């Protein structure tokens, strides 16, 4: 075919990622921990973070093989965060995409440890499967992954989100601060790790970071819009009204697209992903 | 200065260096609660065996303290994560550790689970960002070893094997040893091997250090079980080396494991004497405590 089809592009990359994730975990003793890690890792989904990593690597001159281990690591980290967020002590979710959550199948103890095991394996996998990377670039990827997961990123975001519950002084700025930690850090790491592996310049990385921060926040504003149009927490529409929230969501997507224009037409897949994820949220 | 090597003083000085570096590694920032909760568990004290082993093995292989100290701190962050997660109500359900409330009893189970996750992430970040002078290929080999050590083939696998064993009626010495090599041995082996890798130790040298670490790890667990059963001279049923083998066979096993750890390091020459002395000292201190 001659026509670029984003849905086909994403389906093909998703299949590459899912085959690598499945091969990454062979069952060994104790079988239950491998079963529990595979249960959540191989549950499916959009695989947005690994796809962003591979796509940003290719944008910057790299290839799928260079990015694929880091892409898998980002999905292991994403999966850990979902297992830990679903637990009874946090969101207390019995289902995820209409299937029982990890702790409901394997128990809370094994779910906690499966999350820990996926985070550990993320780091091991990046190193052992990327011998062709420049060693200093690969260490930069490790440092970025560790900073992204921890108290200054995803885990800090989870704590700021818990602290916001049932407060009367939440502002759009403080909601944005929660989201930039809880989701933005890992979306930024997804594009920046692929860029770093490919040797992208600082200037190129800054454009990719603006793209990632903008799409991440747009996704959260659109989630809030759909929730309100369908434990007390303020949301963008409850703080700003629906008119201003819809305008903000559109502005953030437009800003993400503009951020990548200076790469040229090579940026068109990343630019299209911004609008596609939003359009799919309105259809689902 | 003094001229006479004093093992108790050596360990006190290294513990002080590690504790000062652990405290500096966690500067409180937003959200303050996560830093507070990580520090509550990380800075609670203890023997700091793992970081001390790392520094000592790095120096044995010709490295310096500055080369090892960040990895040494990362090993203690990993150890601390494992204690926080182990104490939780879904696992060992412990209300107290080292005389004080456990992390979840102070901050809530949610914050304790996240503090453990924060410490594991920071272990990997800290090794890279605070070891810029290391050979990059050696530092990548440290990261790979730490990832393998923590995960399902090591520490977390061991935690699952230990939880699976709880209340079972069919425990054998083979079953206990399989739990201990994963839950305890993997991280003690990583403590000496990461120090050795940083210093550029050969494969042959690393194999001797790994035998030392596996032997001491198991010996320390057999000695703990000996002390538990001789102190005894609803409570859950839990088989131990002496309940399965008898006290005579358990004592002989613990002595053989320490003798084998010492012999394992003899080929390094007299530079290995501090590591060799740590094996016997930790055991002697257990009998005195
Ligand atoms: Cl409105
Ligand atoms: Cl030698
Ligand atoms: Mg929301
Ligand atoms: Mg364009
Ligand atoms: Mg000797």
Q: Coil, strand, or helix at residue A102?
A: helix
Within 10 A of A71 (CB to CB), how many other CB atoms are there? 30
- Long-range CB contacts (within 8 A, 24+) of A178-182: A179/A216, A179/A217, A179/A220, A180/A213, A180/A216, A180/A217, A181/A152, A181/A153, A181/A154, A181/A156, A181/A157, A182/A154, A182/A157, A182/A158
> What is the sign of the dihedral through the CA atoms of B74, B79, B83 and B86?
positive
Spatial distance between the Cα atoms of A188 and B279, rounded to a whole number of angstroms = 46
Task: For residue B107, list chain A residues with Cβ-Cβ distance below 8 A.
Answer: none
3-class SS at A200?
coil
Q: Which residues sit opposite A96 in a β-bridge?
A: A99
Neighbours of A103 (CB within 10 A): 25
Q: Yes or no: say if B41 and B80 are a contact pair by the CB < 8 Å rule.
A: yes
Cα within 13 Å of Cα(A92), Cβ side: 6
Cα gap B36→B55, rounded to integer Å:
27
> Do residues A127 and B140 lie in contact, with contact meaning Cβ atoms separated by under 8 Å?
yes
- How far apart are the CA of B229 and the centre of ligand 2, in A? 40
Q: CA angle, A275 as apex, A219 and A159 as ends, to 5°?
A: 15
Q: Is the peptide bond before B94 cis (omega within 30 degrees of 0)?
A: no
Q: Are B229 and B243 in contact (CB under 8 A)?
A: yes
Q: Say how many Å lie between the CA of residue B65 and the centre of ligand 5.
A: 22
| CA angle at A163 for the pair A159 and A167, rounded to the nearest 5° | 160
> Is A80 close to B116, i.e. CB distance below 8 A?
no
- Give the count of alpha carbons within 13 A of B36, CB side only: 10
Beta-carbon pairs below 8 A across chains A and B = 166
- Give the per-residue SS3 of A2-44: CCCCHHHHHHHHHHHHHHHHHHHCCCCCCHHHHHHHHHHHCCC
Domain limits at A246? Answer: 1-284
SS3 A87: coil
Instruction: Please answer whether residues A97 and A20 qualify as being in contact, where contact means their C-beta atoms are separated by less than 8 angstroms.
Output: no
Is B95 annotated to bind ligand?
Answer: no
Split into its structural domains, chain A has a count of 1
Radius of gyration (C-alpha) of chain B in whole angstroms = 19
Phi, psi of A163 (to 5 degrees): -65, -25
Looking at the DSSP bridge assignments, the partners of residue A100 are A95
Cα distance between residue A239 and residue A237, in whole Å: 5
Chain A contact set for B116 (CB, 8 A):
116
CA-wise closest residue to B254 among B281, B227, B216: B216
Q: Of the candidates B267, B278, B273, which has an alpha carbon nearest to the alpha carbon of residue B215?
A: B278
Binding-face residues of A in 39-78 toward B, CB within 8 A:
none
- For chain A, the residue count is 284
Residues of A in contact with B157 (CB under 8 A): 29-30, 33, 117
CA nearest neighbour of B198 among B151, B145, B147: B145
Strand partners, B97: B100
CB A33 within 8 A of CB B154: no
Which residues are within 5 Å of ligand 4 (an ion), measured at CB? Answer: A 261
Tokens for A94, please give them: 């019995």
DSSP letter, residue B237? P
Judge contact between B124 and A138, C-beta under 8 A: no
Neighbours of A32 (CB within 10 A): 18
My answer on whether omega of the bond before B256 falls inside 30° of 0, hence cis, is: no
**CA–CA dist B248, A193 (Å, integer):** 57
**B153 at A interface, C-beta within 8 A:** yes
**Spatial separation of the C-alpha atoms in residues B113 and B88, rounded to whole Å:** 8
Closest CA to A80 of B121, B262, B285: B121
Q: 3-state DSSP: chain A helix, strand, coil percent, rounded to 5?
A: 75, 0, 20
For A56, what's the count of Cα atoms within 13 Å in the CB-facing half-sphere? Answer: 31
Q: Is the dihedral of CA B237, B240, B243, B247 positive or negative?
A: negative
Q: Where are the beta strands (DSSP E) in chain A?
A: 95-96, 99-100
Q: Directed axis angle between helix B136-150 and helix B109-129, to 10°?
A: 160
For A25, nearest residue in chain B (alpha carbons): B152
The residue behind tokens 């613990």 is: B254
The rounded distance, in Å, linking the Cα atoms of A220 and B226 is 57
- Are the C-beta atoms of residues B208 and B268 closer than 8 Å to each other? yes
């Amino acid at each position: 075919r001659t026509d670029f089809d984003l849905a086909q592009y994403l389906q093909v990359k998703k299949g590459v990622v899912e085959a690598a994730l499945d091969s990454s975990l062979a069952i060994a003793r104790p079988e239950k921990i491998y079963e529990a890690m595979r249960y959540s890792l191989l549950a499916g989904g959009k695989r947005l973070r690994p796809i962003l990593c591979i796509t940003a690597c290719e944008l910057c001159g790299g290839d799928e093989a260079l990015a694929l281990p880091t892409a898998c690591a980002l999905e292991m980290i994403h999966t850990m965060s979902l297992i830990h967020d679903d637990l009874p002590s946090m969101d207390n979710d019995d289902f995820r995409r209409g299937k029982p959550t990890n702790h409901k199948v394997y128990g809370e103890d094994i779910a906690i440890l499966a999350g820990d095991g996926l985070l550990a394996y993320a780091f091991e996998y990046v190193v052992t499967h990327t011998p062709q990377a420049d060693p200093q670039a690969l260490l930069q990827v490790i440092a970025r992954l560790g900073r992204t997961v921890g108290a200054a990123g995803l885990v800090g975001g989870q704590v700021l989100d818990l602290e916001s519950e049932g407060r009367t002084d939440i502002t759009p700025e403080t909601l944005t601060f929660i989201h930039t930690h809880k989701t933005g850090a890992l979306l930024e790491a997804s594009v920046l790790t692929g860029a770093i592996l490919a040797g992208a310049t600082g200037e190129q990385q800054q454009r990719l970071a603006r793209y990632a921060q903008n799409i991440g926040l747009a996704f959260q504003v659109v989630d809030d819009i759909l929730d309100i149009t369908a434990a007390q927490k303020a949301t963008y529409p409850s703080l700003l009204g629906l008119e201003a929230s819809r305008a903000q969501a559109q502005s953030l997507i437009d800003q993400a697209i503009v951020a990548l224009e200076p790469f040229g037409p090579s940026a068109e897949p990343l630019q299209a992903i911004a609008e596609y994820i939003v359009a799919r949220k309105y259809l689902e």
